[PDB]
CSV table of C-alpha atoms in Angstrom, one decimal:
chain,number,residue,atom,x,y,z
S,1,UNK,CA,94.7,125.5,95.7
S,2,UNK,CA,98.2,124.7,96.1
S,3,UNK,CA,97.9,121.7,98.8
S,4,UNK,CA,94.9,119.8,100.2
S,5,UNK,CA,94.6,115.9,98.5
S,6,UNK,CA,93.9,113.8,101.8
S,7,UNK,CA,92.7,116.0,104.0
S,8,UNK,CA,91.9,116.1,107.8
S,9,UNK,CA,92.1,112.0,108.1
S,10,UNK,CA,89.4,111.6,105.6
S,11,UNK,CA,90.2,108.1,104.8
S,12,UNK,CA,91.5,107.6,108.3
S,13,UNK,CA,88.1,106.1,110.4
S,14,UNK,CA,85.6,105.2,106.9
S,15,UNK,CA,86.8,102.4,104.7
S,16,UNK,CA,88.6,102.6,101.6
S,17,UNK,CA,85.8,103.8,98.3
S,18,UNK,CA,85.5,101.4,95.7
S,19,UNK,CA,89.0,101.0,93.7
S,20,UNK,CA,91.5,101.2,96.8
S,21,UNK,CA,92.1,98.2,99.3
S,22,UNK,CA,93.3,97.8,102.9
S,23,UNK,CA,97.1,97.2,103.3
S,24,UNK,CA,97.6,95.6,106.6
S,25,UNK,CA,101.5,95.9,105.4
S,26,UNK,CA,101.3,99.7,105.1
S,27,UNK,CA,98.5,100.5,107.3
S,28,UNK,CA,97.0,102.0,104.4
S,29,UNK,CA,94.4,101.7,101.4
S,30,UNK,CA,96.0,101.8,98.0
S,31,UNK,CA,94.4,102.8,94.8
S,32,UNK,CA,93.9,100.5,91.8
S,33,UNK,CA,96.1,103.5,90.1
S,34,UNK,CA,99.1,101.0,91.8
S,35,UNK,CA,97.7,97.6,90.9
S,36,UNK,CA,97.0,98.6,87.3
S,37,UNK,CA,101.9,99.4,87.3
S,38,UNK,CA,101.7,96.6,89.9
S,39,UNK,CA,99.4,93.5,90.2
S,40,UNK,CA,101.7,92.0,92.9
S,41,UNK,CA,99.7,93.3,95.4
S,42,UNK,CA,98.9,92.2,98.7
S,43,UNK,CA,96.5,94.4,99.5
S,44,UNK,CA,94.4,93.8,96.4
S,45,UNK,CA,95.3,90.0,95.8
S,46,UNK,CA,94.3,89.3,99.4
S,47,UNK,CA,91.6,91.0,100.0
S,48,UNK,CA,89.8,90.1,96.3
S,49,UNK,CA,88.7,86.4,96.1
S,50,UNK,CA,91.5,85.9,93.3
């Protein structure tokens, strides 16, 4: 309704679902919707191969 997005630690014990990443820096997975505005990161560049 007016607030419920992550929920009770959804993402908090399973991974991250294909398009986020693991950011050791922020202890969190990001979503591509930040690497598409910003492709300097970490948590994408060093987790992907490349």
């Amino acid at each position: 309704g007016s607030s419920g997005s992550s929920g009770e630690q959804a993402p908090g014990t399973a991974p991250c679902s294909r398009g986020s990443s693991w950011s050791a820096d922020l202890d969190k997975c990001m979503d591509c919707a930040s690497c598409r505005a910003r492709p300097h990161s970490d948590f994408c560049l060093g987790c992907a191969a490349a």
